Design a protein around this ligand. Sequence first.
Ligand code: HDD
Ligand code: HDD
Lengths: 727, 727
Amino acid sequence: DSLAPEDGSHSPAAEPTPPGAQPTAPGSLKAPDTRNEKLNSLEDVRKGSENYALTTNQGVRIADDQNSLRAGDRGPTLLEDFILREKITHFDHERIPERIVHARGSAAHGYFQPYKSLSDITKADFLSDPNKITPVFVRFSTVQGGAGSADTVRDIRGFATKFYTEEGIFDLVGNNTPIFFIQDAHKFPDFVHAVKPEPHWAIPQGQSAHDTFWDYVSLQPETLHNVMWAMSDRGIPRSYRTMEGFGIHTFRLINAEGKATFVRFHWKPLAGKASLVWDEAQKLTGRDPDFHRRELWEAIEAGDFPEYELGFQLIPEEDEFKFDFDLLDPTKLIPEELVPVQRVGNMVLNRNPDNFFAENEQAAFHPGHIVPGLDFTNDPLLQGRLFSYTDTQISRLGGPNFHEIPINRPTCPYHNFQRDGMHRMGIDTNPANYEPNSINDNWPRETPPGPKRGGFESYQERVEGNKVRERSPSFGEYYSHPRLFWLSQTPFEQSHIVDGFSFELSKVVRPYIRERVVDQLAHIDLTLAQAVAKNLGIELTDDQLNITPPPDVNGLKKDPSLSLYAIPDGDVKGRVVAILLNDEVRSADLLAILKALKAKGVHAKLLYSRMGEVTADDGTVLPIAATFAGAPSLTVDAVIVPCGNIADIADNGDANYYLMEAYKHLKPIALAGDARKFKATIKIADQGEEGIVEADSADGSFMDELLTLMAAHRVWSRIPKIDKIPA
Amino acid sequence: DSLAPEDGSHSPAAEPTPPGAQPTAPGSLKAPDTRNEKLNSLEDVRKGSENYALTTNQGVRIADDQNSLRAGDRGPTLLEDFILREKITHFDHERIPERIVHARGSAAHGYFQPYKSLSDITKADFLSDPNKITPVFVRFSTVQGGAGSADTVRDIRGFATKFYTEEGIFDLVGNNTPIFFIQDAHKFPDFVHAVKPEPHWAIPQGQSAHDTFWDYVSLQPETLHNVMWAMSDRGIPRSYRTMEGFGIHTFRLINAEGKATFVRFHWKPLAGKASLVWDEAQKLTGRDPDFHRRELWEAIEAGDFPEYELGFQLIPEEDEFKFDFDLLDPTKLIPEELVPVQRVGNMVLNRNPDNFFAENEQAAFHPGHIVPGLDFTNDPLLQGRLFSYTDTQISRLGGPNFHEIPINRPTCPYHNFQRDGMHRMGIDTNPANYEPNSINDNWPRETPPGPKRGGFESYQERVEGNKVRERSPSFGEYYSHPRLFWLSQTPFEQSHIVDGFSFELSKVVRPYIRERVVDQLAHIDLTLAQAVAKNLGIELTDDQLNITPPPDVNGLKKDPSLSLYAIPDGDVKGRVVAILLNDEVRSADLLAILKALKAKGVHAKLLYSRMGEVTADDGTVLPIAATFAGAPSLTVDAVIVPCGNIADIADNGDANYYLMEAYKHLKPIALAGDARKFKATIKIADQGEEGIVEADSADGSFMDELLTLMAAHRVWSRIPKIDKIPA
Ligand code: HDD
Ligand code: HDD
């Protein structure tokens, strides 16, 4: 009855292994000894399988799971086949509505721990002691596309963290840029409808490159700041591990003395900031639409845990009006040059889920889920968010008991007088379902606010004004933050912004929309506007050329913290290199290559023209991970070609193209021995060039140079060379 | 208050226009003069917009749709803002569950007309009169991926037609291959779970290239026939217009005399059969994941209506047991050499929907929706389908009144005693909600069966047997039909099948699964098995090399109707050519090109290195449709390069790569004058070669030669030359 192979090769090892070395697996089978309070609390609903009988949902053992019940073995199926009907009924109802936005997302378990007690600024229990370990569940996402859309689209990314604290669930529901597109939540359906596939034909998926999006942008200049970020390489991250996170809104921290401090939340990636380039990102949506989901899961299985440092920008209440912009305007960022990010703790993602649907798809995050020690502000985008995230779950998760779905359950106590609702799990024994009551001595009871374990009380902010549907005049400035962002980018980052706008606007069919957007760009920076205009065949008018640029932000000419690359921070651990094999590899080269990569935590994939094995010059049998076409250069950070029988691959079109694609995408390339003959396909002269490592053999210096290139992510100096490369 | 441009360039012309000439639009605005009975019946629910006030859903005019109501213009949002809450509530609940399978689909309205009355074989009213026009709504789909997944995946395609007949809705719910993967509906959740993204991590989207799919296949040889089709180029159609359709199951036709005839349904595409090649299809999921949806919509907007001829394979009842296979086995096809397809009528798709969600997403097709004159058989896959398609709508469409959703409503009368349910639209006035009743004189009343307008009565098939969960032994043959399919393919189609298996199995991480699948291939054809094994580094054993091939199918060693290309059926109308411009095009070349393409109904897209315009040698201003990168060769059927200032583009990497990609993908290429210098980038010698049209100018037979190549779809003779091309 055993269908597994006798050698046990069906089962992945329950130990950390590099990407591709083992089949991936549910987290509790891959890493059974990785534990936290939330993961342990899910044990009551985890279901095994080994050595159990196959049954109906009612516990009846099934004898024949291959056939329907029929009148004769060639006869009609009988209505009395309850086993068939139960199985098909469950199948028929598997799908639930996807999230209205951020439907495409990938999630993992982990933990957060503060660096020190923050009691002087907040009474939030999870920040009260460096010994406080708080389990987290984090979901990263795109915004526009459906749950089945591609990972490496150009889009904003979501970054949502559920903190299972001892005083309640706190959800920090943020994005990978520090501002949003719009100012008031009332416009959210308009903006989302504009960016989403257009309603007649439901095109395009996962793209803002269409008329309705740019129509809205051209008519709503408040959007321009976040549009700038989306058109930059920020819109195409290399990995969820290599992007920043931001809460966007100004919130409040409330301490035990009742003092409010304004705060904006930041996540700083330990792996550094790194993004793809557009042609690579777009092609990768075809070669591997699951690239980010896969890379996150495989990093965790390898022990390359994503880590993010939590940071606070803190502004005293008395400083509310000390900036050129309104702190409550979510289209404005707070420059780190003006208000530094103070690091307060670290989050580590160290276990994948067991079941994607049960844990990821059904997870409900909501920024109104705060705890004592935190509070809101009047940011009019945040204010409306507070309504949406509870409301939407009534259809998405089937009713008001969504907190009883296991992933959503608090790990701390919860007791109240709420009852019933669809799929009610908790069986209340309280004689009372109301308060005040005497029949249960008024339990469960209210708790006054206090320094710890106290009830929630809102900060008593003064409100004065008339009931109005009116935007604050302080919000009516749209160009200075886009300009600060533009001026803070490197020259190659600016080029990529220009190319982003140019590519997207080329896909807008109505030319006047393109012209209106270019006019908006002329209010931000005329170099940007002229460069985009040239790519669109648009000529700026003399009036447009005379638009006065917007003022600096509180005296800032630039803020390098807004650039992905101006200040180096990259780390190579967890990156991956393609090694292009031949049928008689120089084993000495491969030994030195793999040894150096291992010392730095860099993974490798051995590629060839077919699957199976090749044998090196010394008899070493080399297992092949993928073909050149099966694992394209898009999926790796650098390419190494060792020596050997180079004639075997010298005329292989896929092998030559592998290097040309990597070259065009600015990736480091290293060539040993006779592999240097491949310089011809990338038009590199005999004297070489920066970004192409070459030597007689692979060695320590050879690998040191390559790993130095990898630490810099891409070879930006190659950009002037790639336009003549046919790739 | 007008935001539209004064020149009116926001509004697409309400007349047929070629792809890209105008913005696309809702069908009733693009083609207001196109009508049918179903389209007319939807007018009661169509909603306009021009010249109307913006309101709440309760009809209250909105004054300020830009702001929430707050206490002061910098204050908190008020709970009494019912306008905000209604708008956000509707947004928060927009999504409904996607279809369990076939979630990704594209749909259009049209009509069907039979060629002559079929009353000798069926009393079905829609087939009773050549003047009887039946409106249709057709949805084409993939199978595996979500609603946001890509079009040009390797997968089976769905082809579902809703016929709004005078005697009820008939849904013909078929696929683009003539068999299914499994024999008994009880296994459907198993097969679908195996092909769908794996449950731990929800990878991969839109792909069968993963362990669990091939695990199931290797353990269920009944799947091998449809697997063969999926691995062939059938799995990657060029367009929904260029694929076949099949009902798969044997059904019955019932005539007025009560005689039953077995029938299998077929759709023959007027545009012929045409598919992509794998590398092109995969890259196209990245460059345009909406390619098939877009092509269908734009063909209809151009007046190039998709057309399909309905055909029947007809088998007398007394011939049930005269074949080598069981007629009720849905893993077996009926070879057209044994039972020809008899043409029945024509279907034309001539109008796009107005709202994708309302009409496409909410449409419910179900093969149990038959009409008098049709009936089922005991095919055990069909039998279980009959349960599923009603059941699934209870969650997907919110309850049992899904037939009241406008797209689903019959156009003929419907009256019964059913009442209530969620979203009940119909307000019944019958004093009775039961029968028999006297209080309404028993109306609505049963109708006896008869030759026309009679009640439904099942064919009184004899049933004899014990109640068993047992597969018919006649179904227990798995290899002859895969072999017949294999032997019917051209040599290049066979190579593409080999490459499909090889690519997919290379993505299976557990090697023993690959080995088990190769063993199954050895039971089908040893040449196929050896070629796949070689690409996987697997050596067949002596026992595998000695497996006796399966028998022929009723004496057939081939049936050319199973090949896409063995018998040419290509038509060029609706195809598209890229024209690569330069900054001083030879206008005489372009005149001849566009004239010849227009005469054959072939579209063109003028491409350059930027948007805007270029000016030809004679001063003609040429509008640019897209950049080389913006509209890659993947999206066209052929490439033409006119003469002019060729030096302007000769060193353009994108322009050179455009030709190399098209060359690798076997597309016709035509080069005029100095454009012949591009032969160097595709390694074509001065002598030229078949598939590369060249001449001093585009006059003479230049365009005839190119259009002849296009009629043959791809340049199969070029295959030996593509492996050296780095593209
Ligand atoms: C008033 C409506 C509204 C507005 C203005 C916003 N959102 Fe939102 N957001 C939703 C309404 C919403 C929602 C419809 O409630 C979602 C979709 C499904 C869900 O559970 O919540 C959601 C989902 C959602 C997710 C995915 C959570 C997950 O992984 O499940 C993230 C990361 C964000 N949002 C982040 C933001 C950010 C950073 C915003 C700007 C500051 C923002 N949202 C504005
Ligand atoms: C017992 C389960 C079952 C089985 C054996 C099949 N299907 Fe099915 N099919 C469904 C259960 C189902 C479903 C779950 O009921 C769907 C999904 C959502 C829906 O409305 O119907 C569906 C959808 C669906 C669609 C999409 C309709 C649309 O566009 O909305 C097509 C074309 C098919 N199927 C075709 C087939 C074919 C050709 C089959 C094999 C002969 C087949 N199905 C077997």
